[PDB]
Amino acid sequence: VWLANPERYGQMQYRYCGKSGLRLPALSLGLWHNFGHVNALESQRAILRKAFDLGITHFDLANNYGPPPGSAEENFGRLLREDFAAYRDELIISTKAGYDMWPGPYGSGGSRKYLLASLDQSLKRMGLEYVDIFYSHRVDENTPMEETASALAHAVQSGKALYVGISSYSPERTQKMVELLREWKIPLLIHQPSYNLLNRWVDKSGLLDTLQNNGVGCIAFTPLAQGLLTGKLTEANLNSLRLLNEMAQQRGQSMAQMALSWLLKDDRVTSVLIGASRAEQLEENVQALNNLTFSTKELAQIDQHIADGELN
Amino acid sequence: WLANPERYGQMQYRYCGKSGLRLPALSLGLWHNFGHVNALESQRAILRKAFDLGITHFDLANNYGPPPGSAEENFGRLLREDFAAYRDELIISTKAGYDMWPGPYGSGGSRKYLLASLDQSLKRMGLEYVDIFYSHRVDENTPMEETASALAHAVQSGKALYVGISSYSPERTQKMVELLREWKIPLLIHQPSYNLLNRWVDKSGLLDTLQNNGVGCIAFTPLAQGLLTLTEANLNSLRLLNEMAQQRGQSMAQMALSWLLKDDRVTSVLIGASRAEQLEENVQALNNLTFSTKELAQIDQHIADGEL
Amino acid sequence: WLANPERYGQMQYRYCGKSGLRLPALSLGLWHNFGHVNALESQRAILRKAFDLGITHFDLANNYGPPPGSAEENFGRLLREDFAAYRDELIISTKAGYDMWPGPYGSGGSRKYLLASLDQSLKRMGLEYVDIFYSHRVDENTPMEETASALAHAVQSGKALYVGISSYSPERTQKMVELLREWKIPLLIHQPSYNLLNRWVDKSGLLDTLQNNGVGCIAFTPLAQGLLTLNSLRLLNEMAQQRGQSMAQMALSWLLKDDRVTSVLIGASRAEQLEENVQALNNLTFSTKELAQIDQHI
Amino acid sequence: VWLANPERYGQMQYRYCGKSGLRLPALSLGLWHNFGHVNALESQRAILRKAFDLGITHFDLANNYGPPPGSAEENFGRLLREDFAAYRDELIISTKAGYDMWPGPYGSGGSRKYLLASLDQSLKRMGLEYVDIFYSHRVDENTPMEETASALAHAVQSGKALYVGISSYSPERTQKMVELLREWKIPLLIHQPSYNLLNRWVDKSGLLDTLQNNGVGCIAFTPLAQGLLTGKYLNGIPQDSRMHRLTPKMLTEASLRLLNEMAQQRGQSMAQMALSWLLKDDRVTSVLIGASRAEQLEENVQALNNLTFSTKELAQIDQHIADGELNLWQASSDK
Amino acid sequence: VWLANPERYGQMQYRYCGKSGLRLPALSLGLWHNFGHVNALESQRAILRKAFDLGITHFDLANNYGPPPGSAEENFGRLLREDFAAYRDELIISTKAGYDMWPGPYGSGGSRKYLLASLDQSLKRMGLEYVDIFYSHRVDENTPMEETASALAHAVQSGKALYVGISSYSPERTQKMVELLREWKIPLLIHQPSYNLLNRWVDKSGLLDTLQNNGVGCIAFTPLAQGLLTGKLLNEMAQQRGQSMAQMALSWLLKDDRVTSVLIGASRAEQLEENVQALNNLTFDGELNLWQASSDK
Numbered sequence A: 001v002w003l004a005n006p007e008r009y010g011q012m013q014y015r016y017c018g019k020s021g022l023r024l025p026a027l028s029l030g031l032w033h034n035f036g037h038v039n040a041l042e043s044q045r046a047i048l049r050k051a052f053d054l055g056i057t058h059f060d061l062a063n064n065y066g067p068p069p070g071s072a073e074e075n076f077g078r079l080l081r082e083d084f085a086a087y088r089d090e091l092i093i094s095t096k097a098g099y100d101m102w103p104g105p106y107g108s109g110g111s112r113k114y115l116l117a118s119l120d121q122s123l124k125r126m127g128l129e130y131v132d133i134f135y136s137h138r139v140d141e142n143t144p145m146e147e148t149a150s151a152l153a154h155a156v157q158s159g160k161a162l163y164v165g166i167s168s169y170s171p172e173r174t175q176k177m178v179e180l181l182r183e184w185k186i187p188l189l190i191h192q193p194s195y196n197l198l199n200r201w202v203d204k205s206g207l208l209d210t211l212q213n214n215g216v217g218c219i220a221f222t223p224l225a226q227g228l229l230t231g232k233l234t235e236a237n238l239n240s241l242r243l244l245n246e247m248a249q250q251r252g253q254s255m256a257q258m259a260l261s262w263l264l265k266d267d268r269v270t271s272v273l274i275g276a277s278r279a280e281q282l283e284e285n286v287q288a289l290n291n292l293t294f295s296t297k298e299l300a301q302i303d304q305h306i307a308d309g310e311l312n
Numbered sequence B: 001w002l003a004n005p006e007r008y009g010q011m012q013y014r015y016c017g018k019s020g021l022r023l024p025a026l027s028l029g030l031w032h033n034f035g036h037v038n039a040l041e042s043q044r045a046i047l048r049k050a051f052d053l054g055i056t057h058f059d060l061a062n063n064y065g066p067p068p069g070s071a072e073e074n075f076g077r078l079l080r081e082d083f084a085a086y087r088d089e090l091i092i093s094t095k096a097g098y099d100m101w102p103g104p105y106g107s108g109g110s111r112k113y114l115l116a117s118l119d120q121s122l123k124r125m126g127l128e129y130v131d132i133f134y135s136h137r138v139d140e141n142t143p144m145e146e147t148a149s150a151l152a153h154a155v156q157s158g159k160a161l162y163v164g165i166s167s168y169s170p171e172r173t174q175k176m177v178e179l180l181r182e183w184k185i186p187l188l189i190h191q192p193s194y195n196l197l198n199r200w201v202d203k204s205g206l207l208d209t210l211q212n213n214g215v216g217c218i219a220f221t222p223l224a225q226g227l228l229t230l231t232e233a234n235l236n237s238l239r240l241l242n243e244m245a246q247q248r249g250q251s252m253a254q255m256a257l258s259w260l261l262k263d264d265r266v267t268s269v270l271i272g273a274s275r276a277e278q279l280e281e282n283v284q285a286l287n288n289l290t291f292s293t294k295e296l297a298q299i300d301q302h303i304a305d306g307e308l
Numbered sequence C: 001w002l003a004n005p006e007r008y009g010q011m012q013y014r015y016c017g018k019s020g021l022r023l024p025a026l027s028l029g030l031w032h033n034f035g036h037v038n039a040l041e042s043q044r045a046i047l048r049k050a051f052d053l054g055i056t057h058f059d060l061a062n063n064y065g066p067p068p069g070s071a072e073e074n075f076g077r078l079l080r081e082d083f084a085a086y087r088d089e090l091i092i093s094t095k096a097g098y099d100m101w102p103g104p105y106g107s108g109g110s111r112k113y114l115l116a117s118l119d120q121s122l123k124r125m126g127l128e129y130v131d132i133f134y135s136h137r138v139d140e141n142t143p144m145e146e147t148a149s150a151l152a153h154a155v156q157s158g159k160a161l162y163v164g165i166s167s168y169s170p171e172r173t174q175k176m177v178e179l180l181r182e183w184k185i186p187l188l189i190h191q192p193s194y195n196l197l198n199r200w201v202d203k204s205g206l207l208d209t210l211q212n213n214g215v216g217c218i219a220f221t222p223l224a225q226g227l228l229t230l231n232s233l234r235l236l237n238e239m240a241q242q243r244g245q246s247m248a249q250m251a252l253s254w255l256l257k258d259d260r261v262t263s264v265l266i267g268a269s270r271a272e273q274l275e276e277n278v279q280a281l282n283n284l285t286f287s288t289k290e291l292a293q294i295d296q297h298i
Numbered sequence D: 001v002w003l004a005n006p007e008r009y010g011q012m013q014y015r016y017c018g019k020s021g022l023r024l025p026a027l028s029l030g031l032w033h034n035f036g037h038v039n040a041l042e043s044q045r046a047i048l049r050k051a052f053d054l055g056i057t058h059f060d061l062a063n064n065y066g067p068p069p070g071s072a073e074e075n076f077g078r079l080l081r082e083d084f085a086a087y088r089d090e091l092i093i094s095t096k097a098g099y100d101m102w103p104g105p106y107g108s109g110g111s112r113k114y115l116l117a118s119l120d121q122s123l124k125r126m127g128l129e130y131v132d133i134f135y136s137h138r139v140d141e142n143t144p145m146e147e148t149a150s151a152l153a154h155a156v157q158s159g160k161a162l163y164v165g166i167s168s169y170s171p172e173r174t175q176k177m178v179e180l181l182r183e184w185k186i187p188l189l190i191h192q193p194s195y196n197l198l199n200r201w202v203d204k205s206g207l208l209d210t211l212q213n214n215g216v217g218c219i220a221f222t223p224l225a226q227g228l229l230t231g232k233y234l235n236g237i238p239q240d241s242r243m244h245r246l247t248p249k250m251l252t253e254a255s256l257r258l259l260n261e262m263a264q265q266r267g268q269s270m271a272q273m274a275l276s277w278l279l280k281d282d283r284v285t286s287v288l289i290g291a292s293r294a295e296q297l298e299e300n301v302q303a304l305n306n307l308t309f310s311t312k313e314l315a316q317i318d319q320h321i322a323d324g325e326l327n328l329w330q331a332s333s334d335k
Numbered sequence E: 001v002w003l004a005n006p007e008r009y010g011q012m013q014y015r016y017c018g019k020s021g022l023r024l025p026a027l028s029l030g031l032w033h034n035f036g037h038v039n040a041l042e043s044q045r046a047i048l049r050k051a052f053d054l055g056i057t058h059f060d061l062a063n064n065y066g067p068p069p070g071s072a073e074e075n076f077g078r079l080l081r082e083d084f085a086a087y088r089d090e091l092i093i094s095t096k097a098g099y100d101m102w103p104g105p106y107g108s109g110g111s112r113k114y115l116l117a118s119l120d121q122s123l124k125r126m127g128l129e130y131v132d133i134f135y136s137h138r139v140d141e142n143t144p145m146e147e148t149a150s151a152l153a154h155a156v157q158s159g160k161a162l163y164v165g166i167s168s169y170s171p172e173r174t175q176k177m178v179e180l181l182r183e184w185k186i187p188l189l190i191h192q193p194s195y196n197l198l199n200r201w202v203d204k205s206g207l208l209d210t211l212q213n214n215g216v217g218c219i220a221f222t223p224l225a226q227g228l229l230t231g232k233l234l235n236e237m238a239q240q241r242g243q244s245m246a247q248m249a250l251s252w253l254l255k256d257d258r259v260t261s262v263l264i265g266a267s268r269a270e271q272l273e274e275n276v277q278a279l280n281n282l283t284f285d286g287e288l289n290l291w292q293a294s295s296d297k
């Protein structure tokens, strides 16, 4: 019998997702790594329990997370049944379809076949009646967005997803998906782009404007550039990373914490989607919330060191 | 049973019209050879070979057998036995429109027949849904509004992922596209008879209507039920068409299929089989999909000369 | 589908040993012609004709097909389609003992094999229980106490109404009667190979063991697989002609000439063969002279 | 989809269990270690697939195997569903109740309450309608054997277990259990004692004679003394070993260097000889090995190539291999 | 989510029930009163939680406990589902049939009809596959004991009761029930008689000897004479021992290995806390046996 921390909602920051009434935790946990059948279930269990005890209420999955593909969703479903029986309604669970999942022409892409068949498999693996958020995981340029949109609408209409989202769509495609979903009277909830201090296509492309103009949330994935922004590649690269680490030290933050605080420095990002291989990493990362302020000078110096090391 | 791991290596897949659904260039139909009059072991060897060759689309109708219904039952049986892990790699269709059961609700295009028939097909196959449900033919006594709305209810209720029509004129096809658009459903596919010796589809303007509306085309009786495998002039022309195939290094069947697949106007050709070896032969059509301008003229000329 | 209303008018039924169960004098076996290699419509026409002739007993085993299990599955399908309203008018048997599935639990007489096999058979046929469950053969490496107790568990648990054995010697039969009596279950039936050209049953004393213990006898391969349909076979055919019978009919009548045999378990590949075979019942008498001449030729 | 090795039944030896018709593989796999939630499911899957591909058809479990308790049974149930859907009827699956499993007075021991509640939990964890063998896992001197026996009989009668067994019972208690089960017309199938070259209470006590006289099988547990009889601890304690994760207290001055020579002389590893030795007698039905990786199964099954020992060999072993003081289950067998 | 006290098994004493392997807590909770639909569910919840947190693992019910009849079993089923979902297998739950439950000739007594139909209703009310102990609740002199026994034996054989018991049977009828149940290879587990300082028919009749000789446990009911032995001259002896009167009355029953358990009631948690402290000092007619009709037959 497991009891979650009664103070779990006392310290975490929650942000409204775009114009919706759904509040996401400022840090969410992704299950891309460390939740496959290659990882011991006890290690996974400790991570999920610590995340919920820190008030992280959003867990982000996809069909092909593991390895092997599907295993994160299965393991998550097991831990849900064992430790989160009483807590499902306090969690926001997402899954996605778009990348290679199973063999053949219906195992990848953006067709109605793949999306709806995949959603069913994901709900069965996780033991859920519905996900909170179902995503088109990437752009499929060979499926008309009308078809992808109508699949997402069917997920909602049928009660298999409460809300829908997209991931790695250009601003123009995002705008088209908002419009197609509006024809079904469904608001696009959220957009999940890769976004970190060293990868700012989101800024440069004008995505954040499209999102804000349409009331769509933003959840940043690989916010630590998969560990590059943690301190653990040319000479100028390393020297810049060293200087960024020194800025983080000046702020009283690890490099990881400053990378997260930077994404969260303004309202433009709803949540950052962190990974963890152990509970202590969650404890460190959520402390990013203790220092979300950057001076104009700091923001310039950060961009400058990135310019100087050619980390763009 | 384990499907061939290399099954997706050689088959060609085509997007169905403007949709994201990729059909195999050759699909298997179950019109013949899958009734209760046919041994289940023979059926099993055919379906297993089809999937091993990368044929992912299996086309059924309520009344396929004989007797009526039995193709769907037998398929369902084999699906459970051998394809338990593979449903989501398959495109399965059924249809309603011809005589299936006695009386005024057993044929035609009414909401009663279509929906009651879809339910019977899902139960016989053991499926929650078909990938493609079709109106199997035109019913001039049911308003197309009723037929279209029945197809829409199928989609809405989760009993069919997509819908199609079979043997509709270009004008009726265009009206069905429009009626289904009112429901925000794109018509996926049209299934006409179409082969070297039967080109109403081209001449009527059907292929243009399909392409213009982003509807796929799957050719039924692509071998003219074996003719492409009778007066003197007919036979003599078929002999010459056979010789052109020989020149190409193809059987007549393979050339007949390649010809339909020579361009993007056809999504798929719907072949039958009574044994596994015929599937092996037919899919080799993909090795030679090119026809010169001269070849296409000579083919049409021999067809003209034999009055085929 | 409606069964012939006169189906009980002509068939002869015999009490199985001392029990109250009446079997038809001719029963249908599904050893051949009911596999996935045989079209279902042909199978359907055979079963409908058998029931229309009053044959109420259908004999199956786990490994009947081919492939193994397919007879039981095809039977289950036809039961559901055509015999939905008639299950309680039918006596259905199955068996375990021969090779069914790979490995050490897929053959023989163990509790593991018999009880697992029964479960698979009931699932393949779509039945809550069989009327008769059999040990299909002797397993000299499993103690009979184990085999018997498995059969008893089948009865106690409601998976089989009665139990039987097949191809057991008179001595092993007697032991199985005794082991089952310890459970207060009477052995219903013995199924031996028995025909004009294979009479170990007579020579061994089996029929006496069966009668003494009230156990029924159902003869399998009663036509020696079709052989009883060269110079001696010619003369046996001439005796059949003299009786106004086909050779097949005489072979069956011969087995049924005594109260010693409850039923003969025929196979059929088409309906017409059933129609011919049941007419054996029109001439069940043999003179002493005939019986001698038959033995003399054969 | 997964396909088992078609030749899986070509090399393994199967032995009739006592006087029953149940044939166990001469090597069985136990899930005491390496199948908990602390062990990756992929590693477990590779072990079970290799075991079945070698013809090992018997998997032995217990309620409290893991860690944590219950997790071996849950993981096994998952793998059964995923890889062995078509093969359940080719497997012999056991579980047990008798050690500490859950808190309180009903969570340990031999009572009808504990045994029947536990069997239900094991079936639910494994996703099975029944186990092939249900055991009383040890002696409980405070529960009358009549109660324990009757609980095992209810397991059989109700269809939750095909056969029943006992583990670590003295010859006298074994004999009583055979008698009490006979009153229910159930034959006791099997006895599971600790038995290896360095732990021979089974020989000394007369247990093998009791078992044969009652037609009861014998499945030898810790047949490698947990790894000690593998030689893996002759020149150091390896990183990837149970002892680094069974302690170095067991490596006393008191055998292994001598035994290793004898094994070399036979063309066997020490592990193989240890197994062959248990299997030299037709009264040992099987040896119940553990494995932390597939390669260990491949080595161990080759024990079956050399099951013969000369009088001299047996004499030297009896002379020169003293009790190892490693029977951690002696409490049960001394009652 | 509710978590039971992790030290719940640290203080309670457990006793083997007769010759069986089943260990009952020395104090068990009965639901005769205070668990009907006339009692707030929150109050009931606080009592059961405290009982378990003190290591009391046995809860004793009957079909007609309430009021109204059946309601204790229903309330208990609810609380089981809400707070004891993870703990069923740590609990010993009993029910009974024998007194008036429903109208008519099948609603009382010892017939196979009443006992088996009643067991099915009890299991449905409590949401349980089986009870740990099913009892014949009293003697029915108009049903042959062979019938009652066989009904108890069917409960066990069918998996609806793990063990069976009897309540308020004379020594002679107890002995007959032991013998009848042995013909089914079932040992009678337990006898539940009224027994307290002011009501000792159990001693005088020879029942404790019959029980011990047959390996049957004894669970004492109305051990506080319903509250009379709580205080609301004996009180002065209790004071001398450093005990409340209640504690001394319970200690007295538990002074011997003759009593497996004393079956207390409670209307609030604090009474459980007080009563279990009886275990700290186990060393040493009121005309109130309202269940004497049954024990006199």
Ligand SMILES: NC(=O)c1ccc[n+]([C@@H]2O[C@H](COP(=O)([O-])OP(=O)(O)OC[C@H]3O[C@@H](n4cnc5c(N)ncnc54)[C@H](OP(=O)(O)O)[C@@H]3O)[C@@H](O)[C@H]2O)c1
Binding pocket: A029, A030, A031, A032, A033, A034, A060, A061, A137, A167, A168, A192, A220, A221, A222, A223, A224, A225, A226, A227, A230, A256, A257, A273, A274, A275, A276, A277, A278, A281, A282, A284, A285
């Ligand atoms: N939609 C998409 O296309 C997409 C693509 C990628 C990811 N994502 C999502 O985003 C999530 C985040 O991606 P990611 O795993 O690359 O996240 P990240 O936050 O970029 O890196 C996470 C990893 O960095 C390490 N780490 C985390 N906190 C740390 C700390 N305080 N100090 C040192 N190291 C630390 C851990 O790895 P070690 O255990 O190796 O130390 C952890 O597993 C995923 O789980 C997934 O759901 C989505």
Ligand SMILES: NC(=O)c1ccc[n+]([C@@H]2O[C@H](COP(=O)([O-])OP(=O)(O)OC[C@H]3O[C@@H](n4cnc5c(N)ncnc54)[C@H](OP(=O)(O)O)[C@@H]3O)[C@@H](O)[C@H]2O)c1
Binding pocket: C028, C029, C030, C031, C032, C033, C059, C060, C136, C166, C167, C191, C219, C220, C221, C222, C223, C224, C225, C226, C229, C248, C265, C266, C267, C268, C269, C270, C273, C274, C276, C277
């Ligand atoms: N317990 C055991 O060990 C065991 C072993 C074997 C059989 N059996 C049982 O015994 C049953 C009978 O075995 P069986 O099929 O060999 O029996 P059989 O009656 O000796 O031979 C039947 C076959 O003979 C042919 N036949 C039948 N009637 C005929 C007629 N009137 N005219 C011409 N040909 C005729 C048919 O074969 P064609 O028409 O194809 O030539 C038919 O399939 C089985 O179905 C089975 O249930 C049991």
Ligand SMILES: NC(=O)c1ccc[n+]([C@@H]2O[C@H](COP(=O)([O-])OP(=O)(O)OC[C@H]3O[C@@H](n4cnc5c(N)ncnc54)[C@H](OP(=O)(O)O)[C@@H]3O)[C@@H](O)[C@H]2O)c1
Binding pocket: D029, D030, D031, D032, D033, D034, D060, D061, D137, D167, D168, D192, D220, D221, D222, D223, D224, D225, D226, D227, D230, D232, D240, D241, D242, D243, D271, D288, D289, D290, D291, D292, D293, D295, D296, D297, D299, D300, D329
């Ligand atoms: N009834 C009971 O009370 C009881 C008690 C104990 C056990 N058991 C049963 O008996 C089974 C076996 O117990 P056990 O695992 O201690 O038996 P074991 O066979 O004495 O020990 C097996 C361990 O030895 C190592 N090993 C095996 N083969 C090897 C080789 N060829 N080379 C090197 N190392 C090798 C492995 O450990 P590492 O690789 O991790 O070092 C493996 O996990 C249990 O799984 C359970 O089913 C029952």
Ligand SMILES: NC(=O)c1ccc[n+]([C@@H]2O[C@H](COP(=O)([O-])OP(=O)(O)OC[C@H]3O[C@@H](n4cnc5c(N)ncnc54)[C@H](OP(=O)(O)O)[C@@H]3O)[C@@H](O)[C@H]2O)c1
Binding pocket: E029, E030, E031, E032, E033, E034, E060, E061, E137, E167, E168, E192, E220, E221, E222, E223, E224, E225, E226, E227, E230, E232, E246, E263, E264, E265, E266, E267, E268, E271, E272, E274, E275, E291
């Ligand atoms: N088999 C049968 O025929 C039969 C018959 C009767 C009972 N029983 C069983 O035995 C159980 C016990 O019956 P019972 O409730 O009369 O038993 P009891 O132990 O004689 O009395 C319990 C009652 O005494 C009062 N009390 C308890 N502890 C106290 C304390 N420490 N200080 C002050 N007052 C205290 C409480 O009543 P207040 O707090 O409201 O005053 C409580 O409801 C029943 O629940 C039932 O399961 C069986």
